[PDB]
Each structure stands twice: as C-alpha cells, then as structure tokens.
Amino acid sequence: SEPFSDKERSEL
Amino acid sequence: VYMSPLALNNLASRLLRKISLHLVMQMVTAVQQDLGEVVSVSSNVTNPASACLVRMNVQGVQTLAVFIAQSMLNPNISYGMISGLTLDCFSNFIYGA
C-alpha cells in the first residue's frame, strides 16, 4: 500500500 | 524533415505521442510524515524547511519527468521555460538545489 504506481502522460 | 514545417510538425507530433514513463513513488503523505520527523516541524512555526513540505505534489514529478524524457529524444522540437528565476533565487537553498 506504500507504493502507488503512475503511467505518465496521464490526463488524471 | 527540418526543411519543411509540416514535416517537422509531424515528427514532433509523433515523438510526443510515443513517450511513456512508468514511475513508482511513495505516498505523498508518508514522505511528509517522514521528513516531518527529520526536521522537527512545529505545527505553529513557519520556517523554510516546514513550508516546502507542502508544495510537494505528484503531478509535478509527472510533468517534470515527461519533459526530461522528450527533451532527450530530439533537441529541435521543443524548449522549456523555467519558472521563478528571481534575481537572488539561489539564496533559497531548496529552489537552488
């Protein structure tokens, strides 16, 4: 639960 | 490509569409809670160290990385405009560093 991963170039 | 606007615009257009970075970061929270301990944040005192721990967002890292990325694929498609270049910005160690 510590790391939340991000795919970048995301329109959140 | 560098001779025709149209041709270059398409090069750039595609150069950007392809960019994809995959990063993993800790919880915005936990990092605060951690430095918060390392510096001893008095929830009453306003001081440099304490203040910066709030302008800490994830979106920033996204934008920053993606930039670092394209800026590395082809130097002739785009430029960046740095923000906050005050005359003596360097006297603000954080920004400076």
From Swiss-Prot, chain A:
Intracellular or extracellular location(s): Virion; Host cytoplasm
Transmembrane segments: none
UniProt source species: Rice dwarf virus (isolate O) (RDV)
Protein family (similarity comment): Belongs to the phytoreovirus protein P7 family.
Stated name of the protein: Protein P7
Described function: Probable component of the transcriptional machinery present in the inner capsid. Displays dsRNA binding activity and may play an important role in the sorting of viral RNA and virion assembly. Together with the RNA-directed RNA polymerase P1 and capping enzyme P5, forms an transcriptional complex positioned near the channels situated at each of the five-fold vertices of the core.
UniProtKB/Swiss-Prot annotation, chain B:
Localization (cell): Virion; Host cytoplasm
Disulfide bonds: none
Function: Capsid protein which self-assembles to form the inner icosahedral capsid with a T=2 symmetry, and consisting of 60 P3 dimers.
Similarity-based family: Belongs to the phytoreovirus inner capsid protein P3 family.
Subunit structure: Homodimer. Homomultimer.
Protein name: Outer capsid protein P3
Record lineage: Viruses, Riboviria, Orthornavirae, Duplornaviricota, Resentoviricetes
Shown residues in whole-protein numbering: 293 to 389 of 1019
